[PDB]
Structure formats: structure tokens, C-alpha cells
């Protein structure tokens, strides 16, 4: 029916836009993690020595905890660029008040980074540098405090999240639903945001009934996690507060300073 | 304020 059809068109536009925006998809990521891909396997980083030997297969651009954390920074910065491009493809997003565009991204990007990082993660580790590395969870836990506790909440969220076995086509809409959140602090004009999100939420619902018809309210569980995501971010911001105070021989990439300044 | 985000959004 035509109401359903408009919401299919939206699901397809978003999916296409997601594939162009984001180099490594959950499809490819999963392949790499299960060895299904016939492509060269990722260099495994499990200790100080493997990390040193790994520098050839990844891009670093003094101590190991600081250098890992700086690598995370670089991943985030590139993710923020990709997410910003994907946001601009969300019908109606660019017609919003530019100050609102900036507020939605400012509060949205980390929730989306952690959603999309779950695609790169299993209980044992995370793909890095577009899946040409694999950094073990144990190694990231092993780091000296406060860096030791930095990635563990993201793994904890990822193992739960990956159970829903969403694919790209699903994640494309879910990610847009997160960006268009009408309740972010300091929004000037909530109504056109809620109007777009209402449409995205209908597309997400239709999408979760068609692409997983053996599932049932996959839709309802997914909306609950949108609150799990905000706590990862709240918790993550506090840890950045700690890290920025306790350490002095590292600054934050300027893009991440903009985002984190006057955030929770 | 949010100079880089503005730049990425206006690019």
C-alpha cells in the first residue's frame, strides 16, 4: 500500500546512503570476524609487542596506553566525518536550523559510534583500521588505569546489542532515528525534528517487520537500547573528564573538544 | 563555536 511504500523508499534511500557514507559495513565486518571472507585476515594485537609489530598494517599519524587512546581519537574523528555525511542524506535534515543540525550531531555522534562499533566487536575483540587489525578485549582491559576501563563498557553494550542480529539495512534507519532526537539539550525548534523522527520510526518499524518477520518487536527492544546508549556516553564523558585531568602529556583532537565541551 | 562541525556540515 502507498503509505508502506513511501516508508520502503525511505528505508532504501537511507540504506544506499549508509553504504556510501561508511566504508566498513556490518556485512563485511562479520565476514572478517568469521573468516568467511577469502580476503587477507586482520593482524591480531594482544600485547605490547604485537602492537609494535602491527604499526605496519595500521596508521598512528609516548607510552602505550596514551598511544592506543590517541588511536581511538582518530577512529572517532573519522566516524564523526562519516556520520556527518550520512546525516546530510537524511531527508529534511539539512533544511533544519543549522544550530539544531550541530546540536543533533553533537549529542548523536557518540551514540552512533558505539552502535556501529558493536558491528566491529565480538566478546573477544574489535576490528580496527577498516578490519585490517583485530585488538583483543583482554589487551584493552590490561592497559593501566584509567585507560584499562575505557573500552569495556562498549564491549558490554556490544554483546547485548549484537543479539538482535540487525543488518546494515536496519542499522541505517536506527542510526537516523538516533540523530533526529527531539529531546537533546538546547534544541531551538523541536517540532520539525520530531516530525522527521516520527517518519524514520515508522520506516524502522516497517523495516523490522519485513527484514525479520520470524522476529517479533525486534522494534520494541531496539528503542529500549537507545537509553543504554546515552549511559555509555554519560559514563564515557566522565571517564574523558578523569583522563583529561589525571594526564597532562596529551590533548584531545579539536573536533572531539567541540563535541565534548558543554556535554553532560 | 563548533567551527569544525559547521565546516563539516557546510562543506
Curated annotation (Swiss-Prot), chain A:
Limits of the NR LBD domain: 6-262
Keyword Transcription among UniProt keywords: yes
Compartment(s) where it occurs, according to its Swiss-Prot or TrEMBL record: Nucleus; Cytoplasm
Motif (9aaTAD): 254-262
Induction conditions: (Microbial infection) Expression increases when incubated with M.tuberculosis or its lipoprotein LpqH; induction is TLR2-dependent (at protein level).
Cross-link Glycyl lysine isopeptide (Lys-Gly) (interchain with G-Cter in ubiquitin), sequence positions: 20
Source superkingdom: Eukaryota
Reported impact of residue 73 to P: In colon cancer; sporadic; somatic mutation; loss of ligand-binding
Entry GO terms, CC: chromatin; cytosol; intracellular membrane-bounded organelle; nucleoplasm; nucleus; receptor complex; RNA polymerase II transcription regulator complex
Tissue: Highest expression in adipose tissue. Lower in skeletal muscle, spleen, heart and liver. Also detectable in placenta, lung and ovary.
GO molecular function, one term: nucleic acid binding
Annotated binding of rosiglitazone, by residue: 73-76, 110, 236, 260
Keyword Nucleus attributed: yes
Annotated keywords: Activator, Biological rhythms, Cytoplasm, Diabetes mellitus, Disease variant, DNA-binding, Glycoprotein, Isopeptide bond, Metal-binding, Nucleus, Obesity, Phosphoprotein, Receptor, Transcription, Transcription regulation, Ubl conjugation, Zinc, Zinc-finger
Connected disease: Defects in PPARG can lead to type 2 insulin-resistant diabetes and hyptertension. PPARG mutations may be associated with colon cancer. Obesity: A condition characterized by an increase of body weight beyond the limitation of skeletal and physical requirements, as the result of excessive accumulation of body fat.
Subunit and partners: Interacts with FOXO1 (acetylated form). Heterodimer with other nuclear receptors, such as RXRA. The heterodimer with the retinoic acid receptor RXRA is called adipocyte-specific transcription factor ARF6. Interacts with NCOA6 coactivator, leading to a strong increase in transcription of target genes. Interacts with coactivator PPARBP, leading to a mild increase in transcription of target genes. Interacts with NOCA7 in a ligand-inducible manner. Interacts with NCOA1 and NCOA2 LXXLL motifs. Interacts with ASXL1, ASXL2, DNTTIP2, FAM120B, MAP2K1/MEK1, NR0B2, PDPK1, PRDM16, PRMT2 and TGFB1I1.
Function description: Nuclear receptor that binds peroxisome proliferators such as hypolipidemic drugs and fatty acids. Once activated by a ligand, the nuclear receptor binds to DNA specific PPAR response elements (PPRE) and modulates the transcription of its target genes, such as acyl-CoA oxidase. It therefore controls the peroxisomal beta-oxidation pathway of fatty acids. Key regulator of adipocyte differentiation and glucose homeostasis. ARF6 acts as a key regulator of the tissue-specific adipocyte P2 (aP2) enhancer. (Microbial infection) Upon treatment with M.tuberculosis or its lipoprotein LpqH, phosphorylation of MAPK p38 and IL-6 production are modulated, probably via this protein.
Name under which the protein is recorded: Peroxisome proliferator-activated receptor gamma
Source organism of the structure: Homo sapiens (Human)
Gene: PPARG
UniProtKB/Swiss-Prot annotation, chain B:
Tissue: Widely expressed.
UniProt PTM comment: Sumoylated; sumoylation increases its interaction with PGR and prolongs its retention in the nucleus. It does not prevent its ubiquitination and does not exert a clear effect on the stability of the protein. Ubiquitinated; leading to proteasome-mediated degradation. Ubiquitination and sumoylation take place at different sites.
Compartments it resides in: Nucleus
Entry's transmembrane regions: none
Motif mapping: LXXLL motif 4: 5-9
Entry's family note: Belongs to the SRC/p160 nuclear receptor coactivator family.
Domain notes: The C-terminal (1107-1441) part mediates the histone acetyltransferase (HAT) activity.
Subunit architecture: Interacts with PPARA; the interaction is direct. Interacts with PPARG; the interaction is direct. Interacts with ESRRG; the interaction is direct. Interacts with STAT5A (via FDL motif). Interacts with STAT5B (via FDL motif). Interacts with STAT6 (via LXXLL motif). Interacts (via LXXLL 1, 2 and 3 motifs) with RORC (via AF-2 motif). Interacts with ASXL1. Interacts with the methyltransferase CARM1. Interacts with COPS5. Interacts with the histone acetyltransferase CREBBP. Interacts with DDX5. Interacts with the histone acetyltransferase EP300. Interacts with ESR1. Interacts with GCCR.
Primary role: Nuclear receptor coactivator that directly binds nuclear receptors and stimulates the transcriptional activities in a hormone-dependent fashion. Involved in the coactivation of different nuclear receptors, such as for steroids (PGR, GR and ER), retinoids (RXRs), thyroid hormone (TRs) and prostanoids (PPARs). Also involved in coactivation mediated by STAT3, STAT5A, STAT5B and STAT6 transcription factors. Displays histone acetyltransferase activity toward H3 and H4; the relevance of such activity remains however unclear.
Associated pathology: A chromosomal aberration involving NCOA1 is a cause of rhabdomyosarcoma. Translocation t(2;2)(q35;p23) with PAX3 generates the NCOA1-PAX3 oncogene consisting of the N-terminus part of PAX3 and the C-terminus part of NCOA1. The fusion protein acts as a transcriptional activator. Rhabdomyosarcoma is the most common soft tissue carcinoma in childhood, representing 5-8% of all malignancies in children.
Protein name per the record: Nuclear receptor coactivator 1
Protein's gene: NCOA1
Amino acid at each position: 500500500n502507498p503509505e508502506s511504500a513511501d516508508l520502503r523508499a525511505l528505508a532504501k534511500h537511507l540504506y544506499d546512503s549508509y553504504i556510501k557514507s561508511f566504508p566498513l559495513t556490518k556485512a563485511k565486518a562479520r565476514a572478517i570476524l568469521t573468516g568467511k571472507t577469502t580476503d587477507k585476515s586482520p593482524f591480531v594485537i594482544y600485547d605490547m609487542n604485537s602492537l609494535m609489530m602491527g604499526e605496519d598494517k595500521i596508521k598512528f599519524k609516548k607510552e602505550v596506553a596514551i598511544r592506543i587512546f590517541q588511536g581511538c581519537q582518530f577512529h572517532s574523528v573519522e566516524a564523526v566525518q562519516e556520520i556527518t555525511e550520512y546525516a546530510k542524506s537524511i531527508p529534511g535534515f539539512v533544511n533544519l536550523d543549522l544550530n539544531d543540525q550541530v546540536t543533533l550531531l553533537k549529542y548523536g555522534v557518540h551514540e552512533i559510534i558505539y552502535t556501529m562499533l558493536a558491528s566491529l566487536m565480538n566478546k573477544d575483540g574489535v576490528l580496527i583500521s577498516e578490519g585490517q587489525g583485530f585488538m583483543t578485549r583482554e589487551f584493552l582491559k590490561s592497559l593501566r588505569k584509567p585507560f584499562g576501563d575505557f573500552m569495556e563498557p562498549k564491549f558490554e553494550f556490544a554483546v547485548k546489542f549484537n543479539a538482535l542480529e540487525l543488518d546494515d539495512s536496519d542499522l541505517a534507519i536506527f542510526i537516523a532515528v538516533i540523530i533526529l532526537s527531539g529531546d537533546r539539550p538546547g534544541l531551538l525548534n523541536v517540532k520539525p525534528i520530531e516530525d522527521i523522527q516520527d517518519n524514520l520510526l515508522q520506516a524502522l518499524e516497517l523495516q523490522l517487520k519485513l527484514n525479520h518477520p520470524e522476529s517479533s518487536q525486534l522494534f520494541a527492544k531496539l528503542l529500549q537500547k537507545m537509553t543504554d546508549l546515552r549511559q555509555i556516553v554519560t559514563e564515557h564523558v566522565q571517564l574523558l573528564q578523569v583522563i583529561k585531568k589525571t594526564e597532562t602529556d596529551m590533548s584531545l583532537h579539536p573536533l572531539l573538544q567541540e563535541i565534548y565541551k558543554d556535554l553532560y | 563555536r563548533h567551527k569544525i562541525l559547521h565546516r563539516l556540515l557546510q562543506e
